Design a protein around this ligand. Structure first.
Ligand SMILES: O=C(NCC1(N2CCN(c3ccccc3)CC2)CCOCC1)c1cccnc1Sc1ccccc1
Ligand SMILES: O=C(NCC1(N2CCN(c3ccccc3)CC2)CCOCC1)c1cccnc1Sc1ccccc1
Ligand SMILES: O=C(NCC1(N2CCN(c3ccccc3)CC2)CCOCC1)c1cccnc1Sc1ccccc1
Ligand SMILES: *[C@@H]1O[C@H](CO)[C@@H](O[C@@H]2O[C@H](CO)[C@@H](O)[C@H](O)[C@H]2NC(C)=O)[C@H](O)[C@H]1NC(C)=O
Ligand SMILES: *[C@@H]1O[C@H](CO)[C@@H](O[C@@H]2O[C@H](CO)[C@@H](O)[C@H](O)[C@H]2NC(C)=O)[C@H](O)[C@H]1NC(C)=O
Ligand SMILES: *[C@@H]1O[C@H](CO)[C@@H](O[C@@H]2O[C@H](CO)[C@@H](O)[C@H](O)[C@H]2NC(C)=O)[C@H](O)[C@H]1NC(C)=O
Ligand SMILES: *[C@@H]1O[C@H](CO)[C@@H](O)[C@H](O)[C@H]1NC(C)=O
Ligand SMILES: *[C@@H]1O[C@H](CO)[C@@H](O)[C@H](O)[C@H]1NC(C)=O
Ligand SMILES: *[C@@H]1O[C@H](CO)[C@@H](O)[C@H](O)[C@H]1NC(C)=O
Ligand SMILES: *[C@@H]1O[C@H](CO)[C@@H](O)[C@H](O)[C@H]1NC(C)=O
Ligand SMILES: *[C@@H]1O[C@H](CO)[C@@H](O)[C@H](O)[C@H]1NC(C)=O
Ligand SMILES: *[C@@H]1O[C@H](CO)[C@@H](O)[C@H](O)[C@H]1NC(C)=O
Lengths: 321, 321, 321
């Protein structure tokens, strides 16, 4: 009766809306990014208790790294420990490193917080303050915070140009993030330019509602999501990206869980016939470009199997009344 | 009647062909590549208007980068700007950089095309030609094209050895790209050696129909696809790779969309007690190894559910006549 | 009759166990690792036939590389060829390089085993032993084995801290590897600490049953699997990682298939106004963090379609008797 027409209607609807006539294949993604922008570093940092003038112009080669694994990194802050060489030196004053006597130092001791192996001697670091002498790259990098305003704070004004190429192998269909002939000069805006592949980093942090400066002080991990909802039927054809932004780092703020994003980068060189090293603690934001999607095209066997689930609601819907 | 036997036959066929008795799980891929080959660079390049002799032998450490994220890079061309140091200098003559007077330069101006921050002064670059003086790594890298024949043109003769390891966790089945005891000495050929994991790069560009030289001049992004169609039933067992090749870069040829593949690599050093930098614009092909596949093994619940869609064509096929 | 209740029971069971009422979406993973530990290298290596003292303290910046593509590398051994410069030199004595006369050397010949291009001359390498003179980075790196105990053998005591963030976009559900407030100080143990994100590398090799020392001599590729079985219904809620460990390298032990894991890292520098290079053959373990999983939440259309397969066993189960 009428309930049968409503069962046919709701069933065929669930078919249409849920695209069950379609077979759905996962996508294959390739990413290629070009980061643009420079930054001028004028700041006053404190090195070893003394004030020091940090200046210099930073371009692409000085703060970024080519995209490896659908992700790129933009340095936003740094601490620089210059002139290190293999030797013996008192470890940096810390609750774990301070020693009253040689009894507080055990030869061969290693500590997660330290970067050296103890010799077993208690030596003076400054004045009457004593720390356990270690063998390491000397002098030891100080335990301090990253610069109070991030040295490369201007990075929010930088631009990332993203090129995404997706392919569905089963359906033999290839398409790319940028269709031909589009006006490339634009900034991505949620509404004004939803297809602009040019992203201002500050814009991204506003979309996720995080402040770029705060994250820039100690680093973070941001996420650029490129969603691909795709239809390959022709009766309704659509297959373009949807750009969303999600902040990926944990924001723990606990010294035990290593917050932010940073890494220790070495620059080796020789000086006065001695092996030497300039260690730079590098702070910045890692952007992770996550491309996910599904491509649909009608399958007879799928539409069949669905019908086979559906005739049982024809008959069973008849048996209900 | 006969239509019922044809419905059972077409249904059970769709089962067999579409492997619907089988549950299908996605694969997990690990890649490990070893690139072999060297190249001799004898060429004459033009630096700052003057001819210069570019020579040298390039081995693995000089042109490639270990595989990060199922992809490896092979440099094929380069422009080298040596001796840069932080300072002030006239920007390179360009439609956007040429100034008639100090009125064309605004102090603090930054430009996507430039690598510096303007001081607000109009200075001479050469002769009577004036550009806006900038603060940057000086001298500025010239605006020129990459060498006319690619300096590392020999890269087409290089070899990539690919090692792929796939695992299906649900089915607890692990297999690798190279089965034991195979004659490793071979070049992959579509027909003569379809299982050779040794790929000549030129061969790859011929398969995709792109010329290796052209792409090598300004760089590109190529794609090595490893398809895994796999059957874990035993009645029919097959699970080997299918190597296909697809060119991934967009081939735009528009100065606004940054064509090819290149990146700006810095080499820092100290000289005459001055912080100095040799900037190399690096051109090459990025190879993206895309491993996709599906592993099938018969599922009772799946075969069931399919039968449950199928009995409705038994009965409904009876009701049709 | 009773067989109908057993068909309803086995069917509804297959529903419950196989979670067919649930729609299942694949996960999105982001990884962030921090490696901790240092190593002291005291060893005696043989360079060019003469004994040499290898010593030095190695920290994070000296042996690891930030996580690129859900994978990180820990160097465990190395051979160091210092002072190389572009020139001519006899290739290293090898079955393929040894020449009786200039007839054994062809000008322009390149060989997979060699790192140079032959000049076509047969010269003395040592004493009366002759090899084919090549143009390359000179002197050529010796053909030898990696140090007999791995120089960075202590790497098994190192620690990897893994931070995984997964997201299901369709279900709008985000969760991370580390829930808040957990006691971070711990070592992952299969039973004692199944949720500890802190992994000792030696522990990992014991779990996979490989010896860390052996692999550390010539390198390897290990696999850290993070499985995510997840339920988003609330009636039964569970969504945590399962850490498993699988050794990914092929363990071929054949000189033709490049066993282990190693790469040739160049350190360029200038000396006596000559372009020079220190080549280091780097041996270590690459860890591949493989995050896979599935998130389930009940779907009306799915539960429907299943019922539609099921009523045909109601009726067909009736027709069987
Ligand atoms: O040197 C500095 N940064 C260089 C970094 N590079 C990037 C490019 N890498 C790279 C490597 C291989 C292939 C391709 C690319 C290398 C490493 C370091 C890691 O983080 C990103 C940038 C640095 C930091 C802090 C203050 N200064 C300066 S250099 C400087 C000196 C004087 C004036 C201005 C800048
Ligand atoms: O130096 C040159 N190329 C080195 C590259 N490397 C690769 C290896 N990287 C790497 C880094 C970390 C871990 C593991 C690996 C570093 C960067 C640069 C980026 O592109 C690939 C090669 C270079 C370019 C243009 C003319 N010359 C020369 S060097 C030279 C000088 C004189 C004679 C012959 C070669
Ligand atoms: O130099 C040595 N190792 C440095 C490695 N780095 C890591 C960090 N990379 C990196 C690059 C860009 C961004 C971020 C990071 C660079 C390359 C080399 C590749 O393998 C990992 C470590 C090395 C090897 C063998 C003996 N010695 C020494 S240095 C030394 C000298 C004297 C005393 C102690 C150590
Ligand atoms: C990013 O760029 C904007 C625009 O150039 C900067 O904002 C300008 O700042 C200057 C002085 O710093 C002011 O005179 C302008 O009025 C500002 N313009 C706008 C539109 O706000 C901003 O400071 C830059 N960000 C960083 C971190 O340097
Ligand atoms: C790649 O290698 C081939 C083979 O060695 C090169 O082709 C040879 O070139 C030499 C002179 O350049 C000729 O004498 C040979 O007859 C050629 N052999 C063949 C089979 O063609 C080729 O030039 C190399 N490619 C590049 C870019 O250097
Ligand atoms: C990893 O660390 C352990 C613990 O410090 C080392 O084992 C100790 O070795 C010292 C001397 O080498 C002995 O005196 C201790 O009794 C050992 N302790 C234990 C618990 O075994 C081990 O040698 C380190 N591994 C490497 C490769 O250096
Ligand atoms: C995919 O479709 C295009 C359409 O022209 C065709 O040229 C190409 O050969 C197809 N791919 C395969 C593998 O058949
Ligand atoms: C692109 O759009 C901008 C406005 O946002 C406009 O100024 C510019 O001229 C356009 N480019 C072209 C080539 O039309
Ligand atoms: C996978 O199968 C092998 C076959 O011998 C078995 O040894 C191994 O334990 C299985 N894996 C698991 C997790 O049970
Ligand atoms: C591998 O095949 C080649 C021919 O392509 C042959 O010359 C070589 O001897 C073979 N290797 C072995 C070990 O049989
Ligand atoms: C996901 O759920 C949270 C729950 O509060 C909500 O705030 C958020 O807006 C949801 N995401 C979307 C895209 O609606
Ligand atoms: C964490 O557990 C260890 C024992 O494994 C204990 O010594 C330590 O005090 C605990 N930390 C906290 C904060 O409770």
């Amino acid at each position: 009766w009428i309930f049968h027409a409503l069962v046919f209607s709701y069933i065929s609807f669930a078919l249409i809306s849920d695209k069950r006539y379609q077979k759905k294949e996962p996508l294959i993604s390739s990413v290629h990014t070009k980061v643009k922008g420079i930054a001028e570093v004028k700041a006053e940092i404190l090195e070893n208790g003394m004030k020091k003038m940090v200046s210099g112009v930073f371009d692409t080669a000085d703060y970024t790294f080519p995209l490896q694994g659908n992700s790129f990194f933009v340095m936003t802050n740094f601490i620089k420990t210059e002139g290190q060489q293999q030797g013996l030196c008192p470890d940096f004053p810390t609750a774990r490193t301070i020693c009253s006597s040689d009894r507080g130092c055990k030869k061969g001791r290693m500590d997660p917080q330290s970067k050296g192996i103890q010799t077993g001697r208690c030596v003076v670091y400054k004045e009457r303050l004593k720390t356990c002498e270690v063998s390491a790259w000397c002098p030891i990098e100080e335990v301090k915070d990253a610069p109070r305003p991030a040295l490369l704070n201007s990075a929010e004004n930088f631009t990332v140009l993203i090129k995404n190429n997706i392919d569905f192998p089963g359906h033999n269909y290839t398409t790319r993030n940028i269709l031909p002939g589009v006006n490339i000069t634009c900034t991505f805006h949620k509404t004004q330019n939803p297809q602009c592949p040019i992203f201002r980093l500050g814009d991204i942090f506003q979309e996720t509602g995080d402040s770029f400066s705060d994250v820039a002080i100690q680093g973070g991990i941001m996420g650029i999501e490129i969603y691909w909802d795709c239809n390959l039927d022709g009766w309704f054809h659509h297959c373009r990206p949807k750009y969303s932004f999600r902040r990926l780092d944990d924001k723990t703020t606990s010294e035990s869980l290593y917050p932010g994003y940073n890494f220790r980068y070495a620059k080796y060189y020789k000086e006065n016939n001695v092996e030497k090293r300039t260690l730079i603690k590098v702070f910045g934001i890692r952007f992770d470009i996550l491309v996910f999607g599904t491509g649909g095209k009608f399958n007879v066997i799928q539409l069949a199997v669905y019908i086979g689930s559906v005739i049982s609601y024809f008959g069973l819907a008849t048996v209900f009344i």
